[PDB]
Each structure stands twice: as C-alpha cells, then as structure tokens.
Design an enzyme around this catalytic site. Structure first.
Site, PDB file in Angstrom:
ATOM      1  N   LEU A  14      -3.372 -19.177  -7.027  1.00 15.20           N
ATOM      2  CA  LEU A  14      -4.743 -19.248  -7.500  1.00 15.20           C
ATOM      3  C   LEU A  14      -4.828 -20.267  -8.465  1.00 15.20           C
ATOM      4  O   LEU A  14      -5.038 -21.602  -8.186  1.00 15.20           O
ATOM      5  CB  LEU A  14      -5.158 -17.977  -7.748  1.00 15.20           C
ATOM      6  CG  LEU A  14      -6.885 -17.888  -8.320  1.00 15.20           C
ATOM      7  CD1 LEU A  14      -7.506 -17.728  -6.703  1.00 15.20           C
ATOM      8  CD2 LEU A  14      -6.868 -16.598  -8.993  1.00 15.20           C
ATOM      9  N   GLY A  15       2.149 -21.436 -14.862  1.00 16.41           N
ATOM     10  CA  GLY A  15       2.566 -20.332 -14.540  1.00 16.41           C
ATOM     11  C   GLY A  15       1.943 -19.614 -13.183  1.00 16.41           C
ATOM     12  O   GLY A  15       0.936 -20.384 -12.887  1.00 16.41           O
ATOM     13  N   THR A  16       2.468 -18.297 -12.811  1.00 15.48           N
ATOM     14  CA  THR A  16       1.923 -17.895 -11.563  1.00 15.48           C
ATOM     15  C   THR A  16       0.536 -16.943 -11.711  1.00 15.48           C
ATOM     16  O   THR A  16       0.631 -16.085 -12.590  1.00 15.48           O
ATOM     17  CB  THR A  16       2.932 -17.034 -11.034  1.00 15.48           C
ATOM     18  OG1 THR A  16       4.373 -17.992 -10.973  1.00 15.48           O
ATOM     19  CG2 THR A  16       2.640 -16.679  -9.706  1.00 15.48           C
ATOM     20  N   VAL A  17      -0.209 -17.381 -10.840  1.00 17.80           N
ATOM     21  CA  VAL A  17      -1.749 -16.784 -10.957  1.00 17.80           C
ATOM     22  C   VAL A  17      -1.892 -16.528  -9.274  1.00 17.80           C
ATOM     23  O   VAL A  17      -1.880 -17.263  -8.658  1.00 17.80           O
ATOM     24  CB  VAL A  17      -2.563 -17.570 -11.440  1.00 17.80           C
ATOM     25  CG1 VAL A  17      -3.930 -16.880 -11.635  1.00 17.80           C
ATOM     26  CG2 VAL A  17      -2.513 -18.113 -12.951  1.00 17.80           C
ATOM     27  N   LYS A  34      -2.081 -12.711 -13.573  1.00 19.44           N
ATOM     28  CA  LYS A  34      -1.068 -13.632 -14.138  1.00 19.44           C
ATOM     29  C   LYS A  34       0.199 -12.841 -14.309  1.00 19.44           C
ATOM     30  O   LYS A  34       0.103 -11.762 -14.595  1.00 19.44           O
ATOM     31  CB  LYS A  34      -1.436 -13.877 -15.895  1.00 19.44           C
ATOM     32  CG  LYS A  34      -2.230 -14.961 -15.937  1.00 19.44           C
ATOM     33  CD  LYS A  34      -2.716 -15.343 -17.163  1.00 19.44           C
ATOM     34  CE  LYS A  34      -3.538 -16.503 -17.219  1.00 19.44           C
ATOM     35  NZ  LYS A  34      -3.648 -17.157 -18.412  1.00 19.44           N
ATOM     36  N   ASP A 126     -10.216 -20.534 -28.216  1.00 20.23           N
ATOM     37  CA  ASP A 126      -9.928 -21.481 -26.920  1.00 20.23           C
ATOM     38  C   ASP A 126     -11.214 -21.691 -26.185  1.00 20.23           C
ATOM     39  O   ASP A 126     -11.069 -21.619 -24.769  1.00 20.23           O
ATOM     40  CB  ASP A 126      -8.998 -21.094 -26.273  1.00 20.23           C
ATOM     41  CG  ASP A 126      -8.292 -21.921 -25.307  1.00 20.23           C
ATOM     42  OD1 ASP A 126      -8.823 -23.264 -25.316  1.00 20.23           O
ATOM     43  OD2 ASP A 126      -7.140 -21.658 -24.419  1.00 20.23           O
TER      44      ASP A 126
HETATM   45  C1  LIG Z   1      -9.430 -21.726  -8.431  1.00 19.37           C
HETATM   46  N1  LIG Z   1      -9.035 -20.773  -9.509  1.00 19.37           N
HETATM   47  N2  LIG Z   1      -8.382 -21.516 -10.804  1.00 19.37           N
HETATM   48  C2  LIG Z   1      -8.306 -20.782 -11.543  1.00 19.37           C
HETATM   49  C3  LIG Z   1      -9.213 -19.522 -11.259  1.00 19.37           C
HETATM   50  C4  LIG Z   1      -9.619 -18.030 -11.801  1.00 19.37           C
HETATM   51  C5  LIG Z   1     -10.477 -17.411 -11.161  1.00 19.37           C
HETATM   52  N3  LIG Z   1     -10.791 -16.036 -11.588  1.00 19.37           N
HETATM   53  C6  LIG Z   1     -10.467 -15.488 -12.489  1.00 19.37           C
HETATM   54  N4  LIG Z   1     -11.187 -14.287 -12.786  1.00 19.37           N
HETATM   55  C7  LIG Z   1     -10.725 -13.618 -13.958  1.00 19.37           C
HETATM   56  C8  LIG Z   1      -9.662 -13.729 -14.414  1.00 19.37           C
HETATM   57  C9  LIG Z   1      -8.488 -14.929 -14.197  1.00 19.37           C
HETATM   58  N5  LIG Z   1      -7.390 -15.050 -14.570  1.00 19.37           N
HETATM   59  C10 LIG Z   1      -6.710 -16.018 -13.941  1.00 19.37           C
HETATM   60  C11 LIG Z   1      -6.892 -17.542 -14.771  1.00 19.37           C
HETATM   61  C12 LIG Z   1      -6.218 -18.701 -14.364  1.00 19.37           C
HETATM   62  O1  LIG Z   1      -6.172 -19.699 -15.098  1.00 19.37           O
HETATM   63  C13 LIG Z   1      -6.837 -14.234 -15.570  1.00 19.37           C
HETATM   64  C14 LIG Z   1      -5.772 -13.373 -15.277  1.00 19.37           C
HETATM   65  C15 LIG Z   1      -5.092 -12.755 -16.395  1.00 19.37           C
HETATM   66  C16 LIG Z   1      -5.456 -13.039 -17.613  1.00 19.37           C
HETATM   67  C17 LIG Z   1      -6.698 -13.833 -17.972  1.00 19.37           C
HETATM   68  N6  LIG Z   1      -7.382 -14.256 -19.038  1.00 19.37           N
HETATM   69  N7  LIG Z   1      -8.408 -14.903 -18.812  1.00 19.37           N
HETATM   70  C18 LIG Z   1      -8.505 -15.121 -17.553  1.00 19.37           C
HETATM   71  C19 LIG Z   1      -7.401 -14.363 -16.701  1.00 19.37           C
HETATM   72  N8  LIG Z   1      -9.247 -15.427 -13.182  1.00 19.37           N
HETATM   73  C20 LIG Z   1     -10.940 -17.906  -9.575  1.00 19.37           C
HETATM   74  C21 LIG Z   1     -10.693 -18.936  -9.326  1.00 19.37           C
HETATM   75  C22 LIG Z   1      -9.473 -19.753  -9.926  1.00 19.37           C
END
Ligand SMILES: Cn1ncc2cc(Nc3nccc(N(CCCO)c4cccc5[nH]ncc45)n3)ccc21
Length: 265
Positions: A14, A15-17, A34, A126
């Site tokens: 979507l 480091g690894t997400v 994350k 941030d």
């Molecule tokens: C296409 N794309 N890129 C990033 C991204 C993020 C989301 N939505 C989302 N919603 C809630 C949390 C979250 N994340 C991932 C952020 C990635 O940069 C998190 C996971 C764990 C801890 C976190 N803290 N703040 C955010 C976050 N992302 C949808 C599409 C996306």
C-alpha cells in the site's frame, strides 16, 4: 495485542505497508498495517512506531486515525483503521476539480482534530498534507504520530536536544531556531498544509534548501497565494505563519476561521 489468526493481509503493498481485514467481535474491519521484520529491523524505527502506538492509544477523536492494535507474529505489525482514499496531497494531485468549499471542509476537519490534540496537550510535529488521510472525499483524519509528544504538565512546549532529520519546510521558526515545539508550532505547519491543499498537493518551498527557507522566513517573506485560492484562506495561511509564536493563533482560533456558519467566540 491482536490475534494473528484474525488478520488477513493483501500482498500488494500500500518500509512495508499493507491493507488487511481484521475480524472484530461481529464485523470485519478494513485496516492499514505497518510491518517490520522481527530480527533484521531497525530498532529506532520500531521505537518510533511503539511511541506512535503509545500516543494514539490515548487519543479519541473522529478526525484522528484510530489504532486497532499491535500484532506480534511472523512480523511486527501496527494496525490502524484504514482511511482508504489515502494521503490528501496525492488525492488532490489526481483530483483537480475538488471544489473550494470541499477543500475548506477537509482542512476544517483537520483543525477540529488539532483543536482536540491541543486541548489534550499533545504536539504532532509532522503535520503535512501527506499525513492527512481521507476516509471519503468529505472526511479527513490526521495520521502519523511517530514524532508526537505528550507535553509536560508545567510547559506548553517540548524541547528537542538539537535538530534531527525533520520536515523543516513544515516547521515554525522557533522549532528550527530553538528546538521548541508547541501547539502553536503545529499551527504554523497547518498553514503549510493549507497551502498544499489549495495548490492541489504541490510541495511547499519548491526548489529551496531548508537553510534558504529559514532565511526567507526571517526576512518576513512567505509563499504566494496559490492560483485560484480563496483570498480568505490565503489570509488565514498568513496568520498561521506569524513569526512570533506569542502572536500566532492557537488551534481554537484557527478552527473558528474555517467554519462555514455563523458563530460567537
Ligand atoms: C495509497 N496509499 N498510500 C498510503 C496510504 C494510506 C492509506 N490509509 C491509511 N489509513 C490509516 C492508516 C494508514 N497507515 C499507513 C500509512 C502509510 O504511509 C498507517 C499504519 C500504521 C500506522 C500509521 N500511522 N499513521 C498512519 C498509519 N494508512 C490508504 C492508502 C494509501
């Protein structure tokens, strides 16, 4: 701590997400995760995500991303409710016909989340359009609390030891000059975020080094009005960019200025 058996992750990053689905007591909830390696990880990056979890477990507001939990399994995972449309800067780069009233609505929601954060005496540190995540095109949430701090009871600011690796183009002068972070410092950042939102996700201070931005700001110079930006919103940006922290508004004052109805102070 979460149960790995109740979590399904989609392979496509979507480091690894990753996106995933977490089985709650009755319904499934869509989550964003994350993921860190268990052994070959960066301990400081893990400490930052543990610090983020510690902050986000204390917060409860509709305009702040909600944490589901941490999962310790084949990898170390921080699990959040997903705001599926993603970052505001990328969204506005790809959707250039979002109307002024809709952008004001979104940045007003961010100001409501930040008014809550300020009342709670946490500093975000941030606050940028990349860290505003959209639930829908009419519902924004603040994310990324990795640099966030709970303020001491006797001070209105967090003092960093020195300058680290920071998002300097979003930071107030007192952050850069004295390493002091208050909710008014986050108001400065919010002004930059507004500029990004009305510039359909363009980067602020294009082409400039951090040192050049510091010198520009000290001379009283500011970014110009984005093409087509409502004048009242550019005027609020300039108020957020008040150099002296004591004369800069807090979020209670900023949030009032983003309301689209009559009110009293
Ligand atoms: C296409 N794309 N890129 C990033 C991204 C993020 C989301 N939505 C989302 N919603 C809630 C949390 C979250 N994340 C991932 C952020 C990635 O940069 C998190 C996971 C764990 C801890 C976190 N803290 N703040 C955010 C976050 N992302 C949808 C599409 C996306």
């Amino acid at each position: 701590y979460l149960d790995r058996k109740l979590l399904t992750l989609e392979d496509k990053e979507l480091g690894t997400v990753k996106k995933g689905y977490y089985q709650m007591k009755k319904v499934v909830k869509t989550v964003a995760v994350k993921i860190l390696k268990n052994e070959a990880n960066d301990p400081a990056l893990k400490d930052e995500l543990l610090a983020e979890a510690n902050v986000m477990q204390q917060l409860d507001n509709p305009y702040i991303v909600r944490m589901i939990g941490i999962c310790e399994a084949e990898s170390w995972m921080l699990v959040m409710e997903m705001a599926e449309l993603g970052p505001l800067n990328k969204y506005l780069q790809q959707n250039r016909h979002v109307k002024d009233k809709n952008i004001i609505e979104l940045v007003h929601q961010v100001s409501m989340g930040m008014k809550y954060l300020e009342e709670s005496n946490f500093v975000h540190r941030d606050l940028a359009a990349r860290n505003v995540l959209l639930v829908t095109q009419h519902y924004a949430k603040i994310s990324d609390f990795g640099l966030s701090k709970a303020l001491r009871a006797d001070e209105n600011y967090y003092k960093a030891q020195t300058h680290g690796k920071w998002p300097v183009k979003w930071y107030a002068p007192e952050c850069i000059n004295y390493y002091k972070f208050s909710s008014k410092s986050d108001v400065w950042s919010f002004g930059v975020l507004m500029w990004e939102a009305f510039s359909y996700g363009q980067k602020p201070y294009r082409g400039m080094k951090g040192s050049e931005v510091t010198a520009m700001l000290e001379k009283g110079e500011r970014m110009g009005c984005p093409a087509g930006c409502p004048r009242e919103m550019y005027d609020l940006m300039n108020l957020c960019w008040t150099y002296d922290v004591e004369n800069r508004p807090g979020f209670a004052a900023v949030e009032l200025r983003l309301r689209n109805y009559y009110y009293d102070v």
